[PDB]
Structure formats: structure tokens, C-alpha cells
Design a binder for this molecule. Structure first.
Ligand SMILES: [Cu+2]
Ligand SMILES: [Cu+2]
Lengths: 118, 117
């Protein structure tokens, strides 16, 4: 089936934005999971995508903006951004986040680190 | 329909012996849950009509999907398609974040509303 495992790795993070590196961990028929490695002082500009985006902060500290809201996000915090909802972020510290997209975000399939897929 | 959620060390609700659960956030297509799992516990074999993609925040487990068996450490990830048999053995005090698609309605009742903004 669409079953897959993936092992953690410290390499193969593809650049996306200045200070923002991305890697697709796993994906299936309905979801796609990425891991965002973001550097202190960097920033995600405002963008909208036709994919629901639900996330979890593994480490670090960021400021997550959604619509009019502005919230400081630290390790263990989570968020769910519906499709086409404006969102951006300021990266205050070296942070890592796990973000799952739905439906399967076809564009990010190519970022999969196939060296770690079991 | 957007929402943030802050981390809180409580309101992790009973699910199974040694398995506590908390729904962090949920949307129109996804639902995120966090499983706190005690060393030596086990999830029994089950199937649900929801795709289950997960990330191991900490610990060490043994995840079974169909014939496959893999030892899962922190930073590892998996994806279990809908109605696929799966279970796990817990080797250490572990934490996993799991997202379900479509939004798993019967898990909305585990949402820790005290930390949702
Ligand atoms: Cu985005
Ligand atoms: Cu399950």
C-alpha cells in the first residue's frame, strides 16, 4: 500500500527560502508530512496555498501570524491553517517544525529524502 | 477556522493502559493528536477509515504496519493508509504526534480546549 516509514537524518534538507530548509518525511493518499528547519533571524513571507496545513513545533521559538492573529510559538505548540488562509512567520530562534499538508501536496513530493525511506 | 494551541503538561486523557492522548488542533481536513506512551505499553492491532501519518517526538517504539516492522526513534516518521492493520510496542517513554485525514471526528472529544487560542 501507501505504507512507508522514514528514518531521521540531518542532511538532504532542500533550500526553500533564506534560512528556511525543507524535507518531506513521508506521504500517503491524503497527507504529506514535511519538516521545516529554520534559522534564527529568517522569515517566511506571506503566502496562501490550497492545502490545509497543520503543524507542530519540535524546537525553537517563532512568531506565527495567521489572518489578523499573532502568536508566539515554542516547543510543543501546534497550529492548523486551513487552505488559502494567509499566514507568515518571523523566526526568532533556530526552530524546527513538523508540518502536515492535506491533501497530498504534489509539489513537495520531490523533496522526499529517499535515502532514509524504509 | 484557523487555530493555535499552546503546549500544556496536563489534560492528557486516558486512552489505554500507559497510553494517554490529547487532540492538539483540528481543521477541515486534518486532526492532530499527541500520544504519551509509557515504557513497555502496547497499542493493539486496529484499523480505522483514516490515514494516520505520524512523527515520533521522543522515545523508542516498534511500529508494525501489515507485514512490516521497524524500530522508530525520535525524528522518525510513518504513514499508515486507511483501514490498514497497525499496532506498536513501546520500548521507552515515548511521545508521538499523529495527524489523521479526513478529520477524525470521534477524536475531537479529546481536544484540550484550555490551550486553544
Ligand atoms: Cu505554508
Ligand atoms: Cu491507529
Amino acid at each position: 500500500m501507501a505504507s512507508m516509514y522514514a528514518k531521521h537524518s540531518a542532511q538532504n534538507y532542500q533550500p526553500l527560502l533564506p534560512g528556511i530548509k525543507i524535507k518531506t518525511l513521508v506521504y500517503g493518499e491524503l497527507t504529506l508530512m514535511t519538516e521545516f528547519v529554520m534559522d534564527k533571524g529568517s522569515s517566511l513571507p506571506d503566502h496562501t496555498h490550497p492545502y490545509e496545513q497543520t503543524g507542530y513545533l519540535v524546537s525553537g521559538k517563532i512568531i506565527l501570524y495567521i489572518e489578523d492573529k499573532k502568536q508566539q510559538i515554542m516547543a510543543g505548540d501546534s497550529w492548523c491553517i486551513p487552505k488559502n488562509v494567509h499566514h507568515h512567520a518571523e523566526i526568532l530562534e533556530n526552530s524546527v517544525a513538523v508540518e502536515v499538508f492535506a491533501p497530498t501536496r504534489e509539489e513537495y513530493i520531490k523533496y522526499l529524502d529517499r535515502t532514509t525511506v524504509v
